[PDB]
Design an enzyme around this catalytic site. Structure first.
Site, short mmCIF file in Angstrom:
data_model
loop_
_atom_site.label_atom_id
_atom_site.label_comp_id
_atom_site.label_asym_id
_atom_site.label_seq_id
_atom_site.Cartn_x
_atom_site.Cartn_y
_atom_site.Cartn_z
N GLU A 85 0.93 -1.86 -0.22
CA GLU A 85 -0.21 0.21 -0.14
C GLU A 85 0.94 1.21 -0.34
O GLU A 85 1.69 1.27 0.41
CB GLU A 85 -0.73 0.02 1.28
CG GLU A 85 -1.53 0.70 1.27
CD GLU A 85 -2.95 1.14 0.16
OE1 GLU A 85 -2.69 1.41 -0.80
OE2 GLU A 85 -3.78 0.18 0.40
N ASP A 113 -1.85 -5.77 0.82
CA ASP A 113 -1.13 -4.45 2.19
C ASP A 113 0.02 -4.54 2.68
O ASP A 113 1.08 -3.32 2.37
CB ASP A 113 -2.24 -3.21 3.09
CG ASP A 113 -3.35 -2.98 1.87
OD1 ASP A 113 -3.06 -2.72 1.82
OD2 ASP A 113 -4.81 -3.57 3.25
N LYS A 139 -14.43 -8.08 3.09
CA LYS A 139 -13.04 -8.07 2.44
C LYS A 139 -12.49 -9.47 1.92
O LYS A 139 -11.79 -9.99 0.80
CB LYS A 139 -11.62 -7.41 3.28
CG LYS A 139 -11.68 -6.45 3.23
CD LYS A 139 -10.19 -5.70 3.28
CE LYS A 139 -10.14 -4.21 3.40
NZ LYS A 139 -10.45 -3.10 2.32
C1 LIG Z 1 -8.39 5.66 -3.74
O1 LIG Z 1 -9.17 4.45 -2.53
C2 LIG Z 1 -7.86 4.48 -2.41
C3 LIG Z 1 -6.45 4.43 -2.71
C4 LIG Z 1 -5.88 3.67 -1.99
C5 LIG Z 1 -6.14 2.86 -1.34
C6 LIG Z 1 -7.08 2.72 -1.01
C7 LIG Z 1 -8.17 1.57 0.49
N1 LIG Z 1 -7.31 0.59 0.35
C8 LIG Z 1 -7.40 -0.79 1.40
O2 LIG Z 1 -5.92 -1.55 1.51
C9 LIG Z 1 -8.27 -1.04 1.97
O3 LIG Z 1 -8.47 -1.96 2.89
C10 LIG Z 1 -9.13 0.56 2.12
C11 LIG Z 1 -8.24 2.04 1.32
C12 LIG Z 1 -8.49 3.43 -1.09
MN LIG Z 2 -6.52 -2.87 2.95
MN LIG Z 3 -4.76 -1.59 -0.30
MN LIG Z 4 -3.84 1.44 -2.71
#
Ligand SMILES: COc1cccc(C2=NC(=O)C(O)=CC2)c1
Ligand SMILES: [Mn+2]
Ligand SMILES: [Mn+2]
Ligand SMILES: [Mn+2]
EC number: 3.1.-.-
Length: 200
Positions: A85, A113, A139
């Site tokens: 991430e 992540d 999830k």
């Molecule tokens: C534009 O939206 C985005 C951008 C970057 C990350 C995420 C997320 N990632 C996750 O792993 C997660 O678990 C929630 C949200 C959402």
């Molecule tokens: Mn996540």
């Molecule tokens: Mn993610």
């Molecule tokens: Mn991401």
């Protein structure tokens, strides 16, 4: 009390590196941090949780997992986690594909992540304002790789993780839960919390 802006909250309570990484990810996906402001705060929170999950966790010369909270880890120490991430999509997949061809771990369908070199698995981190079991199932149903481990944190301290396997010691998870409590309390002092909670 006076209603603050979520923009102000985000800029004041998150490290500028986190904020910039979050803005970039929102733009990559066509969302505007100045309009989807609750989402902006949620992205910052989740990325901080990912960093904090990784923080201070190494694999030592012997190959055992250890915790080193000082600023100076021994030079032979290797980070226990890879952080996926926060990377843009080309770099995130580059890192994933690399791990997979190296360690032999299969490729997931969606970007996870983290990768845990101790447990030899990808991790999906979740942070939720709703019941952890509900979010866990969402999830789980989305990725269904069934090798990716899922670990969900709520803002009120509840956790849920795949096979009741929580990966980290209690103190590490406690750091995360304390930070989440702090974010909620501060949002609440600015009258931002109710709305942030309800928008998930
Ligand atoms: C534009 O939206 C985005 C951008 C970057 C990350 C995420 C997320 N990632 C996750 O792993 C997660 O678990 C929630 C949200 C959402
Ligand atoms: Mn996540
Ligand atoms: Mn993610
Ligand atoms: Mn991401």
């Amino acid at each position: 009390g006076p209603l603050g802006s979520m923009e102000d909250f985000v800029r004041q309570c998150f490290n500028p590196m986190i904020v910039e990484l979050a803005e970039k990810a929102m733009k990559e996906y066509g969302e505007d941090p100045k309009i989807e402001t609750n989402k902006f705060a949620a992205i910052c929170t989740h990325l901080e949780v990912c960093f904090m999950y990784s923080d201070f966790h190494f694999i030592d010369e012997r190959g055992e997992s250890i915790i080193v909270e000082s600023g100076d880890p021994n030079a032979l120490l290797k980070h226990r986690f890879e952080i996926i991430e926060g990377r843009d999509r080309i770099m995130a997949w580059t890192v994933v594909n690399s791990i997979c061809n190296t360690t032999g771990v299969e490729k997931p369908k969606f970007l996870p992540d983290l990768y845990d070199y101790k447990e030899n698995r990808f991790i999906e981190i979740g942070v939720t304002r709703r019941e952890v079991h509900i979010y866990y199932l969402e999830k789980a149903n989305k990725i269904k790789s069934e090798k990716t481990h899922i670990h969900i944190f709520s803002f009120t301290g509840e956790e849920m993780a795949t096979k009741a396997d929580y990966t980290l010691d209690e103190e590490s998870r406690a750091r995360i839960k304390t930070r989440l409590f702090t974010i909620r309390q501060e949002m609440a002092s600015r009258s931002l919390w109710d709305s942030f909670r309800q928008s998930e």
